[PDB]
Amino acid sequence: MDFYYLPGSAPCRAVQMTAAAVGVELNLKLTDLMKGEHMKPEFLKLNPQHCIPTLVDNGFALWESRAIQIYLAEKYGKDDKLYPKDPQKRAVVNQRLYFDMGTLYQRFADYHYPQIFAKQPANPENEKKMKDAVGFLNTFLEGQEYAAGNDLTIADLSLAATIATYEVAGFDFAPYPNVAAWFARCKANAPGYALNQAGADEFKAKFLS
Amino acid sequence: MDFYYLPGSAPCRAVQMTAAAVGVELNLKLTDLMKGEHMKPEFLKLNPQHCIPTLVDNGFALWESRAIQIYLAEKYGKDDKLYPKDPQKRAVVNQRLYFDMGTLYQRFADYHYPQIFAKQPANPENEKKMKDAVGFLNTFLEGQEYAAGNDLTIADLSLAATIATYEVAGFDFAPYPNVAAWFARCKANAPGYALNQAGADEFKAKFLS
Numbered sequence: 001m002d003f004y005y006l007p008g009s010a011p012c013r014a015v016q017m018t019a020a021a022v023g024v025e026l027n028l029k030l031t032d033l034m035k036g037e038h039m040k041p042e043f044l045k046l047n048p049q050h051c052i053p054t055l056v057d058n059g060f061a062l063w064e065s066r067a068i069q070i071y072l073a074e075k076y077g078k079d080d081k082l083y084p085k086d087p088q089k090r091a092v093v094n095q096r097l098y099f100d101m102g103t104l105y106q107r108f109a110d111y112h113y114p115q116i117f118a119k120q121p122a123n124p125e126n127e128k129k130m131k132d133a134v135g136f137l138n139t140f141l142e143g144q145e146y147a148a149g150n151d152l153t154i155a156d157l158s159l160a161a162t163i164a165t166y167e168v169a170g171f172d173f174a175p176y177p178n179v180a181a182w183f184a185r186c187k188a189n190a191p192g193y194a195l196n197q198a199g200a201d202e203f204k205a206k207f208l209s
Numbered sequence: 210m211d212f213y214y215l216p217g218s219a220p221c222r223a224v225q226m227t228a229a230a231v232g233v234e235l236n237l238k239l240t241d242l243m244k245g246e247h248m249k250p251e252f253l254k255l256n257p258q259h260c261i262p263t264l265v266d267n268g269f270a271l272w273e274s275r276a277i278q279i280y281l282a283e284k285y286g287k288d289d290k291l292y293p294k295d296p297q298k299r300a301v302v303n304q305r306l307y308f309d310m311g312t313l314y315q316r317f318a319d320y321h322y323p324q325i326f327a328k329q330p331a332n333p334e335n336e337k338k339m340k341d342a343v344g345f346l347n348t349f350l351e352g353q354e355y356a357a358g359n360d361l362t363i364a365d366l367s368l369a370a371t372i373a374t375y376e377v378a379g380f381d382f383a384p385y386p387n388v389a390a391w392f393a394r395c396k397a398n399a400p401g402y403a404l405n406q407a408g409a410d411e412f413k414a415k416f417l418s
């Protein structure tokens with residue numbers, strides 16, 4: 001299974017942890033967006049949206065990190081706890097996954113990427129929105145061990161990939177004890193977290209330091 | 210199943226078509242965001258993220274339209290006619306769902322929201338990104354009957370709710386023959402499309418006055 005990615009990319013790291021969780025080996029294919037590698041004719045033929053992470057499992061090309069996460073869990077996952085089949089349980093995991101992309105990561109990106117890449121002035125309004133995003137997560141975690149319940153799921157892996165990027169960016173998690181508590185839990189229990197930690201650090205040294 | 214919504218909302222319309230497709234009746238509860246009704250104490254207790262659509266199926270509160278769509282298909286859907294169980298086929302639908310949220314609808318909002326709710330001038334740069342999104346969809350449809358294959362899936366319902374909004378917004382689909390055709394097939398085969406058409410027409414209440 002070919003895995004086009006970059007350790008610095010949160011969505012890419014979510015997949016790396018998920019692949020570890022299901023014991024799947026990934027053929028790592030570094031794809032430096034900063035060198036336009038995602039725009040090579042070869043990559044465009046596999047993915048016309050030219051984005052990472054992109055997975056190629058025996059000819060089947062797939063992108064959108066969370067779709068890849070689900071695919072791995074359902075196809076190679078032997079334990080139902082990662083992505084439970086119960087509709088209600090699965091619904092909370094799916095809501096959490098969409099929350100991660102459309103709210104948590106999105107607000108992070110909106111607030112930071114303009115500063116990091118375009119060297120533009122920080123936006124106070126977006127900073128407040130980013131904070132509110134973390135607050136929503138703090139609330140979901142109230143009285144729970146993990147994001148979608150008491151079992152570690154792919155939602156936690158996606159959320160961890162994002163939060164680690166937050167941490168490195170310098171977010172102050174003090175006002176959110178549930179998040180802090182859950183984040184520490186993931187570091188200790190999340191399969192392949194080492195890769196997530198390594199990716200966030202690489203992000204810090206390459207585009208933050 | 211209490212359905213907190215507004216017809217003008219694309220994500221809400223996506224759920225209405227999906228419920229029509231699964232044969233589930235929704236107890237409609239209009240939630241006028243413009244009046245802060247979503248910020249009402251009681252709603253907040255059901256969904257701290259104060260957003261629509263929000264469904265409450267016999268006490269189980271759930272938001273994020275696409276998570277709701279999947280929940281409805283798996284729990285009440287027959288013959289998985291809208292959401293195949295096959296891992297690979299399901300992955301495409303899921304990737305299509307994430308594309309709808311993070312790219313097609315997201316860029317729509319990015320371009321229109323500031324103009325609609327901040328009456329700010331139109332950002333030509335963001336209009337271009339919005340156009341490329343439709344372009345990605347046009348490519349995905351290359352030689353395909355529907356977004357993720359030959360069968361209409363919840364992906365098509367989500368994409369059609371988003372595209373119906375693009376249409377009433379005056380977007381020009383002439384340069385995207387695959388989208389125009391697909392979209393036509395959706396107006397004619399998507400269960401509950403009439404609700405999508407009506408809600409979209411209502412949305413113009415944000416494009417007129």
Ligand SMILES: CCCCCCSC[C@H](NC(=O)CC[C@H]([NH3+])C(=O)O)C(=O)NCC(=O)O
Pocket residue numbers: 006008009010011033034038049050051052053063064065066101307311
């Ligand atoms: C530079 C190192 C840090 C990168 C941080 C952003 S992740 C890279 C980016 N990919 C995405 O944003 C993926 C988002 C998608 N919703 C997912 O979950 O996979 C990309 O390929 N962007 C290029 C493109 O889409 O053209």
Ligand SMILES: CCCCCCSC[C@H](NC(=O)CC[C@H]([NH3+])C(=O)O)C(=O)NCC(=O)O
Pocket residue numbers: 098102215217218219220242243247258259260261262272273274275310415
């Ligand atoms: C008012 C008519 C036009 C509405 C257009 C936007 S849809 C309403 C908006 N909801 C969303 O954006 C939901 C997005 C979510 N990703 C989903 O798919 O459900 C909301 O509740 N926003 C308020 C909030 O989040 O507080």
